[PDB]
């Protein structure tokens, strides 16, 4: 039970005796490392305790596979969950530092990109807090995706430095390395088994990141794979020769698998790298899982017990190769027979779907996949046949015309021949999505409506064939990271008013705030807290954007991936309109119609996506103009926060008044940031999509600004534009014109406005219905502006957003996956 | 004052809480790391204590710069010098390991190649043991030079794996990184100073290896540089594009500087890499030294005090660039004037020469050096002028004919114009050797005769000009590593007979063994010890060479770089003759004429040197034949030990009866292995060269087998061969014929014997006088064979070799450098 003085000793040791800097003085970077190593000392104890019980008990374990994890900063949650935030703060006090300054030294772990990763992370927090035996598997990416600079010219991208010094959190396990093979060829032995030989050979080495549960000892693992090759493979002959580049090739080719996340896949080179990434994750992970299976199994090792001991969850279609790979292992290596293996596979593997549109789902060149993972392609053709035969088995051959339809939809191989078939240069592809539906026992969506969409549109025929497969698992975020730790003031209020502090665990108690949403004491507290958080942000904003804003404005935040479909363009247009109106007013006329705002944008544009990058450039200029216009002062500010990541979100979210979730209706599957915002009392303006629907429902429609056409309406509305039956609002034109006037400086925005004009053509014709939804939007913003004036109302809406949150705790989501998909029971780590 | 139980705790912590392997079980690799980290815990204490006193006292510090350090294994010497070998052995006992098994897990640190490096290492041991404030600077090479496999085909080379897991000994100092610049161009500012801009920019990051003194706290540093480039330089644009190779280029180009040691320099590519290595060492090191100077200097920072506070020692001509670089810094950066700077430079920098022949000394393409380090080339031309003018100043212009001679010899630029000169496409080069003689206050050789040779041949005119420069500093080896630790049995005897244990420090007490060299008790001990060591080797030999040898033979060892001039060819020829004779004898005729031998060869052949590699292949075959010939049994064994390195030498040397040092007379500068052997009571057969001369003198000519033509005689003897006035012995032909007979199997040795035939031609005509010296050699071996029969004699020769050693302690050598070159006084670390 370590106290502050003990921890002081702890920090001092690691500072001197496990050092990574010169001995002189205790600067901040040194202090961080020492603190982190110190914390890890504890994580390792519990990691071991857990690891041991899991080995000895040999219960069923679950394995979450994801290409991305968005872990962000570890320090505060680690000490938080351990319940030592007090002792550590004190310990750093005596060492002449303060906790928040130390903690802000730590880079965000750049292991993920979007909500896909952040889901995975939250899940691990829950999995561990709830004592459920489960691990994550992922790649250990060196340079993340990219770090975002915002420059005069817009967005520039640069490689993440997170590992420049190295991560004090991770643990290398040198004795955990597996062989991964690419390319090469297959043959048959005289035992009649298949042999996959030749190609390229590389290792995959495990790195463990401990994940401590909240108020428990259960400490699980995010095990990350780093690809490499033994030093022997360095070609001394070539190097001494003079061909330095050439000598390195072997190792360069192996390590690049782990360099960056979603590498550019325009090139054939990129696509291959992608496959190599995917395969590496699956192969390495499965090998490790199986190894552990056997190990725990002693002598009485039975392969029919496998699915009762192991569950693999494929987070989206990237870990698709788990299905063929596990077959391969169970057949070629463990020497079971096909049905045995396939039954084991299906009862192990489950699929989680994340996409609404059947084209977001990934497809691979037959030629290319077959050339890289030849033994897999075999196993895939096999399953494609078996499937074809079972489609034929049901339905019958009476309909012919309809059976022809069902094959072309449901078949894993696209543009292939059937094997034997009554029938009386289009490229050959592999539909990974289809493969995932076939090989898994479960296919889940991530939100009521989305799960419905997979059942009834995306995987239509499949649902008819095997309904018992399809499910929903509505997404969530951990209340640990997203309330308890990121928002200390709100936490204090919540604890006060709900009586206990159990709400961090038993998050339903948030609902008890309901009764008090009028209470004017609680409102006064709540506003003090929300202000206090904004104060911090003002400082941040200065340091990062160079812009001094006032805390006494509405914080109007849209932070997410800078895409046309997310319609940053909409929000900023709305902002443009507000500004134009302001400029054509008297000074106290301005005051009257507009509440003071700070409109906060953040998020990353795909490096190569010319429009998205133009959008970012626009927002910065709009800002530049508005912020330095003296006619506007503090009535409106526009900032673009550079390099939005977990840590940024941990800072903006607690301090937000309004969050924008304004995608073209129906196009989002779930969302997670909305859940996070709601939890902190932020009110949401948005369209009816994803979990906007479910949040709105649960917080109450009176505490959520809704606007714009709904999902159903979209088909028709494009139709309309294409027929020339759309009439733009004249306020919409007013903006477009105003931009064209060179109003935001001398950068030319012709091309940008171009995407919003015409009735056809790939980039033209406002396909994302910004002009359409624009009236309802600015209209809805009026309502907002008004509700902000009625502070007693606004504060109730706030409080109720929080009180509605509890169902979006990832604890709930994990309890569900655990009981309705994996089937694992909580293991106590005494 | 840590005891065994404390150390047990220590090992257990580092095992669990600073781990590098899975938690399960305490295997040997895990045990090593934990022990090493444990040891380092202590090294770091003393490293800091030292570092601190050195900062506070601000006395003069010395900096030894070498391209190679041959540190070998650290564990046993670390615990040895700390005096904890007892506690650690016990601690590992309780953890269920034994010390020697643990210690044999540790790779040799692959930071050096030959004696040049091993000198440097020994020096550090002394420097630290003697409390002299001094550090080493070197590059941190990833893959060493190469690891040697011995295969059926001979020698194969492969990249060193020493860092695959990483080194538990080293300490990264992230806040110690310096800029290194290559290429680019120079200009003049309006301040009239020179500006070197553009080119390539890379970092150099310090890694510290603590070096603990014996029975002291003085723990100094071997600071190693690793070259890299910030992550920002990774080209995301290129990577996502698809040109993976291209994106990496920046970082690949920077890191390769530290990949391997003496990279192949056939190519222009290789030569540039070499220069980059050299420069990196000098620049990084000087920057660090100066930084520390300034830091200690506070306010009263005076650049005329510099040489009184700093001495740089250039180990051979590689760190030559220190001279121009230090000028550059003192001028362009610190803004002194030329004379001020040049005076500071000279009074700082000293040269150590290692070569006998004026062509072993390195020369650089003007074009290439000027293109890479343009600002240096300037400074070099400057010095070349100043020199030219001072040559002219003395001597006068009266002789013309002779002044013309003195310029072409002494000038740093080869094939250049004089500036103003009375005179009434040969490539342009820079003579680094000359530059070193000019810029330094000292030029030393490494052995009496060698130092003489530099004075009177190599740097002839220079000596006349500045005699006060030239010196000698006879080489040495540390009695810590080379007696006290590597030979525990001999150590026990030595302590017994010399009364104290002070002989590890006060190594002159070895001479007291003299009086007892007859004493038959001491002989009995001595032989038991030497046998005990051989026992270990028998085991080793089996495991590595696959050959079971008997301990009850003479151990006849030639371990050094496999070159024609070292004449491995001679020894093996001698071996061939012995074998032929044996085969033409009766069984007890064999017994009568030949003592049982195990002839041990080891050492590395330059990868590309076709003859050297053929030689190695020969020795293995000779072995193969002799070892499995049942007519020979245990009378003769020939083994080639693969991958000779410090650790191997620590094992063979204690167990040796006779060591071979049989270079073509006069060609060696010093040698160190001979010193090591002598110390362990090994008797030496050798030619009169290097320190063979000085060892022979000191142990006594009656305890050293000498043979073959002397230095003076060599010129004449080549002359003779070239005139066709050489007559080969018919025993020499007997061997050649015997080989040609296909006697050693079916590999063809025509080309090999070829080098030994003819009177001219580059590879032909036995230029190394193997045939010449062959009679005296085999003759001398007879004497040996005989003296081995007279065990009382043999054991006295042994004992006296040890008693003669004391003067070859590197303590002596360092005391001398310290007082007669650097001028530093012992600093007590209370």
CA distance A348 to A307: 5
Q: Do B20 and A172 touch (CB under 8 A)?
A: yes
Q: Is A540 on the interface with B (CB under 8 A)?
A: no
Q: How many domains does chain B have?
A: 3
Question: Are B299 and B160 contained in the same domain?
Answer: yes
Question: Are B95 and B173 contained in the same domain?
Answer: no
CA distance B552 to B598: 9
Task: Please tell me which residue in B140, B142, B354, B604 is annotated as part of the active site.
Answer: B354
CA distance B259 to B254: 10
CA distance B347 to B468: 13
Element (H, E) at B268: helix B268-297
CA distance B601 to B612: 13
Q: Which residues contact A124 (CB under 8 A, 6 or more apart)?
A: A64, A69, A134, A136, A211, A220, A222
**DSSP-assigned letters across all residues of B59-118:** --EEEEE-S----B--HHHHHHHHT-HHHHHHHHHHTT--HHHHHTTSPPB-S--SHHHH
Distance of CA B346 to the CA centre of its chain: 26
Q: Residue A159: closest CA among chain B residues belongs to which residue?
A: B232
**DSSP-assigned letters across all residues of B705-763:** EE-S--TTHHHHHHHHHHHT-----HHHHHHHHHHHTTTT-SS--HHHHHTTSSSSSSS
User: Is the torsion defined by CA of A775, A777, A779, A781 positive or negative?
Assistant: negative
Q: Give the 3-state secondary structure of residue B664.
A: coil
Our answer to whether residue B185 is catalytic in this structure is no
Tokens of A236: 């001394």
| d(CA A289, nearest CA chain B) in Å | 15
CA dihedral of A20, A26, A31, A34, whole degrees rounded to 10: 50
Q: Give the 3-state secondary structure of residue B594.
A: coil
Q: How many residues are recorded in chain A?
A: 830
**DSSP-assigned letters across all residues of B375-399:** HHHHHHHHHHHHHHHHHHHTT-SSS
Separation in Å, CA A387 to CA A297, A406, A428: 33, 11, 18
Q: Give the 3-state secondary structure of residue A639.
A: strand
Q: Give the 3-state secondary structure of residue B262.
A: coil
Q: Give the 3-state secondary structure of residue A44.
A: helix
Instruction: Give the single-character DSSP code of A330.
Output: I
Tokens of A604: 């990353």
Nearest CB partner across the interface for A236, out of B242, B243, B260 = B260
CA distance A365 to B313: 63
Q: Please work out, in degrees rounded to the nearest 5, the angle formed at the alpha carbon of residue A15 by the alpha carbons of A12 and A20.
A: 175
Burial A315-340 (b: 16+ CB within 10 A, else e): bbbbbbbbbbbbbbbbbbebebeeee
Separation in Å, CA B448 to CA A290, B311, B454, B693: 68, 24, 10, 9
Which of A242, A259, A273 is the best mutation test for B, with the most CBs of B within 10 A?
A242
* Residue labelled with tokens 């938080």: A80
CA distance A215 to A381: 49
Strands B219-228 and B200-212, sheet pairing = antiparallel
A120 neighbors A204 (Cβ within 8 angstroms): no
Strands A219-228 and A200-212, sheet pairing = antiparallel
CA distance B257 to B251: 10
CA distance A312 to A349: 5
CA dihedral of B3, B6, B11, B13, whole degrees rounded to 10: -160
- Residue A576 resides in a domain: yes
**Backbone gaps in chain A, preceding residues (C–N over 2.5 A):** 424
Burial of B812 (0-12, 13-18, 19+ CB in 10 A): middle
- Which residues of chain B lie closer than 8 angstroms to A264, CB-CB? 239-242
Question: Are B489 and B456 contained in the same domain?
Answer: no
Separation in Å, CA B146 to CA B162, B281, B616: 11, 21, 16
Task: Please tell me which residue in B223, B375, B480, B566 is annotated as part of the active site.
Answer: B566
Strands A429-431 and A443-445, sheet pairing = unpaired
Experimental method: X-ray
Q: Give the 3-state secondary structure of residue A347.
A: coil
CA distance B595 to B580: 15
Which residues, numbered 217 to 276 in chain B, qualify as contacts with chain A under a Cβ-Cβ cut-off of 8 Å? 230-234, 236-237, 239-245, 248, 252, 256, 259-260, 263-264, 266-270, 273
* Residue labelled with tokens 């989305």: A450
Which of A2, A159, A257 is the best mutation test for B, with the most CBs of B within 10 A?
A159
In B473-629, DSSP assigns E strands to 554-559, 597-602
CA distance A417 to A757: 44
Q: Residue A270: closest CA among chain B residues belongs to which residue?
A: B242
| d(CA A350, nearest CA chain B) in Å | 29
Q: Residue B266: closest CA among chain A residues belongs to which residue?
A: A241
- Residue A320 resides in a domain: no
Closest CA to A567 of A693, A705, A698, A755: A755
Q: Give the 3-state secondary structure of residue A449.
A: helix
Question: Are B141 and B20 contained in the same domain?
Answer: no
Tokens of B223: 């600071």
CA distance A580 to A588: 15
Which residues, numbered 706 to 745 in chain B, qualify as contacts with chain A under a Cβ-Cβ cut-off of 8 Å? none
B95: containing domain: 1-57+74-107
Separation in Å, CA A561 to CA A607, A616, B685, B785: 12, 11, 78, 85
Question: Are B350 and B488 contained in the same domain?
Answer: no
Q: Which residues partner with A283 through β-bridges? A: none
Which residues, numbered 52 to 91 in chain A, qualify as contacts with chain B under a Cβ-Cβ cut-off of 8 Å? 52
End-to-end CA distance of chain B: 15
Burial B317-339 (b: 16+ CB within 10 A, else e): bbbbbbbbbbbbbbbbebebeee
B775 neighbors B731 (Cβ within 8 angstroms): yes
Q: Residue A13: closest CA among chain B residues belongs to which residue?
A: B41
Closest CA to A778 of A631, A572, A587, A561: A572
- Residue A175 resides in a domain: no
Q: Residue A244: closest CA among chain B residues belongs to which residue?
A: B256
In A229-348, DSSP assigns E strands to 310-315
Question: Are B466 and B483 contained in the same domain?
Answer: no
Instruction: Give the single-character DSSP code of A788.
Output: H
Tokens of B764: 């032909």
* Residues of A noted as catalytic: 354, 560-561, 566, 672, 676
Q: Please work out, in degrees rounded to the nearest 5, the angle formed at the alpha carbon of residue A735 by the alpha carbons of A733 and A737.
A: 65
A631 neighbors A594 (Cβ within 8 angstroms): no
Q: How many residues are recorded in chain B?
A: 830
Question: Are B46 and B152 contained in the same domain?
Answer: no
CA distance B96 to B8: 11
CA distance A813 to A23: 47
Which residues, numbered 142 to 201 in chain B, qualify as contacts with chain A under a Cβ-Cβ cut-off of 8 Å? 142-143, 146, 157-161, 163-165, 171-176
In A506-563, DSSP assigns E strands to 554-559
Question: Are B345 and B369 contained in the same domain?
Answer: yes
End position of a domain, from candidates B441, B457, B474: B474
Which of B231, B256, B260, B606 is the best mutation test for A, with the most CBs of A within 10 A?
B231
- Residue B402 resides in a domain: no
Our answer to whether residue B142 is catalytic in this structure is no
CA distance B818 to B127: 9
Closest CA to B705 of B721, B684, B731, B678: B684
Q: Which residues contact A315 (CB under 8 A, 6 or more apart)?
A: A64, A65, A66, A67, A116, A119, A120, A352, A354
CA distance B408 to B784: 49
B556 neighbors B594 (Cβ within 8 angstroms): no
B626 neighbors B578 (Cβ within 8 angstroms): no
Q: Which residues partner with B706 through β-bridges? A: B686
Our answer to whether residue B676 is catalytic in this structure is yes
User: Is the torsion defined by CA of B542, B546, B551, B555 positive or negative?
Assistant: negative
- Residue A630 resides in a domain: yes
Tokens of A389: 């035969």
Distance of CA B828 to the CA centre of its chain: 29
* Residue labelled with tokens 């990416």: A141
Q: Give the 3-state secondary structure of residue B149.
A: strand
Residue A591 maps to which CATH number?
Answer: 3.40.50.2000
CA distance A598 to A542: 13
Nearest CB partner across the interface for B16, out of A44, A240, A248 = A44
Q: Give the 3-state secondary structure of residue B18.
A: coil
Q: Residue A142: closest CA among chain B residues belongs to which residue?
A: B231
Closest CA to A248 of A235, A237, A261: A235
Task: Provide the phi-psi class of A258: left if phi over 0, else alpha when psi is between -120 and 50, else beta.
Answer: alpha
CA distance B150 to B641: 8
Q: Give the 3-state secondary structure of residue A772.
A: helix
CA distance B784 to B787: 5
Dmax (CA) for chain B in angstroms is 92
Nearest CB partner across the interface for A242, out of B40, B230, B264 = B264
In chain B, helix, strand, coil percent, each to 5?
Answer: 50, 15, 35
A219 neighbors A46 (Cβ within 8 angstroms): yes
CA dihedral of A276, A238, B320, B408, whole degrees rounded to 10: -150
CA distance A749 to A573: 13
CA distance A474 to A740: 44
Q: Which residues partner with B637 through β-bridges? A: B598
Our answer to whether residue B227 is catalytic in this structure is no
Burial A710-735 (b: 16+ CB within 10 A, else e): ebebbeebbebbeeeebebeebbeeb
CA distance A494 to A504: 10
Question: Are B82 and B152 contained in the same domain?
Answer: no
- Residue B794 resides in a domain: yes
Question: Are B675 and B711 contained in the same domain?
Answer: yes
- Residue A226 resides in a domain: no
Question: Are B453 and B502 contained in the same domain?
Answer: no
- Residue B205 resides in a domain: yes
Question: Are B126 and B102 contained in the same domain?
Answer: no
């Amino acid at each position: 039970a370590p106290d502050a003085a003990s921890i002081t000793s702890s920090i001092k040791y690691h500072a001197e005796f496990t050092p990574v800097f010169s001995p002189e003085r205790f600067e901040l970077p040194k202090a961080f490392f020492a603190t982190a190593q110190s914390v890890r000392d504890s994580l390792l104890i519990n990691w071991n305790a857990t690891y041991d019980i899991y080995e000895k008990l040999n219960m069923k374990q679950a394995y979450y596979l994801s290409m991305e994890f968005l872990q962000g900063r570890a320090l505060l949650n680690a000490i938080g969950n351990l319940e030592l935030t007090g002792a550590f703060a004190e310990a750093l006090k005596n060492l002449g530092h303060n906790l928040e300054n130390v903690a802000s030294q730590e880079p965000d772990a750049a292991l993920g990109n979007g909500g896909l990763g952040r889901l995975a992370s939250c899940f691990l927090d829950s999995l561990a807090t709830l004592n459920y035996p489960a691990w994550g598997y992922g790649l250990r990416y060196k340079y993340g995706l990219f770090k975002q600079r915002i420059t005069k010219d817009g967005q520039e991208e640069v490689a993440e430095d997170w590992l420049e010094i190295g991560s004090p959190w991770e643990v290398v396990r040198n004795d955990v390395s597996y062989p991964i093979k690419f390319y090469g060829k297959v043959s048959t032995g005289s035992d009649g088994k298949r042999y996959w030989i030749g190609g390229e050979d590389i290792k995959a080495v495990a790195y463990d990141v401990p994940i401590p549960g909240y108020k428990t000892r259960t400490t699980i693992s995010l095990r990350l794979w780093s690809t490499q090759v033994p030093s022997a493979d360095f070609d001394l002959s070539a190097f001494n020769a003079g061909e330095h580049t050439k000598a390195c090739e072997a190792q360069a080719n192996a390590e690049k698998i782990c360099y960056i996340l979603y590498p550019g896949d325009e090139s054939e080179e990129g696509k291959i790298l992608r496959l190599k990434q995917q395969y590496t994750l699956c192969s390495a992970s499965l090998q490790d899982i199986i190894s552990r299976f056997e190990r725990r199994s002693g002598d009485r090792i039975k392969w029919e017990e496998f699915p009762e001991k192991v569950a693999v969850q494929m987070n989206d279609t990237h870990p698709t190769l788990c299905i063929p790979e596990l077959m391969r292992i169970l057949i070629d290596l463990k020497g079971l027979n096909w049905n045995e293996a396939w039954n084991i596979t299906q009862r192990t593997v489950a699929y989680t779907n994340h996409t609404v549109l059947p084209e977001a789902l990934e497809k691979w060149s037959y030629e290319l996949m077959q050339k890289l993972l030849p033994r897999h392609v075999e196993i895939i053709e096999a399953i494609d046949e078996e499937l074809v035969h079972e489609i034929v088995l049901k339905y019958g051959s009476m309909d012919l015309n309809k059976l022809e339809e069902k094959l072309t939809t449901m078949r894993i191989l696209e543009n292939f021949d059937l094997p034997s078939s009554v029938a009386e240069i289009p490229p050959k592809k592999v539909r990974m999505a289809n493969l995932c539906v076939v090989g898994g026992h479960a296919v889940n969506g991530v939100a009521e409506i989305h799960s419905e969409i997979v059942k009834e549109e995306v995987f239509n025929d499949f649902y008819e064939l095997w309904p018992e497969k399809f499910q929903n698992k509505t997404n969530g975020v951990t209340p640990r990271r997203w309330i308890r730790f990121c928002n200390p003031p709100l936490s204090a209020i919540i604890t006060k008013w709900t009586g206990t502090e159990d709400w961090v665990l038993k998050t339903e108690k948030l609902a008890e705030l309901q009764k008090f949403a009028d209470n004017e004491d609680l409102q006064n507290e709540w506003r003090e807290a929300k202000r206090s958080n904004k104060i911090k942000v003002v400082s941040f904003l200065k340091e990062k954007t160079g812009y001094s804003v006032v805390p006494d404005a509405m914080f109007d935040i849209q932070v997410k991936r800078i895409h046309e479909y997310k319609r940053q363009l909409l929000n900023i247009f709305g902002i443009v309109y507000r500004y134009k109106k302001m400029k054509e007013m008297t000074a106290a006329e301005r005051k009257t119609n507009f509440v003071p705002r700070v409109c906060i944008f953040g998020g990353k544009a795909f490096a190569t996506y010319v429009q998205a990058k133009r959008i970012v450039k626009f927002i910065t200029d709009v800002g530049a103009t508005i912020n330095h216009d003296p006619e506007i002062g503090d009535l409106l500010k526009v900032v673009f926060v550079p390099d939005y990541n977990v840590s940024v979100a941990e800072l903006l979210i607690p301090a937000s008044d309004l969050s924008e979730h304004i995608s073209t209706a129906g196009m989002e599957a779930s969302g997670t940031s909305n859940m996070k915002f709601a939890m902190n009392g932020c009110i949401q303006i948005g369209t009816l999509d994803g979990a906007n629907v479910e949040i709105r429902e649960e917080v109450g429609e009176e505490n959520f600004f809704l606007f714009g056409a709904q999902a159903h309406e979209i088909a028709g509305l494009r139709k309309e534009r294409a027929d020339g039956k759309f009439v733009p609002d004249e306020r919409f034109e007013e903006v477009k014109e105003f931009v064209r006037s060179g109003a935001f400086g001398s950068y030319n925005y012709d091309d940008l406005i171009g995407s919003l004009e015409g009735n056809e053509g790939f980039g033209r014709a406002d396909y994302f219905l910004v002009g359409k939804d624009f009236p309802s939007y600015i209209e809805c913003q009026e309502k907002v502006d008004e509700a902000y004036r009625d502070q007693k109302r606004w504060t109730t809406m706030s409080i109720l957003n929080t009180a509605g949150s509890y169902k979006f705790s990832s604890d709930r989501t994990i309890h569900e996956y655990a009981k309705d998909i994996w089937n694992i029971e909580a293991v106590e780590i005494a």
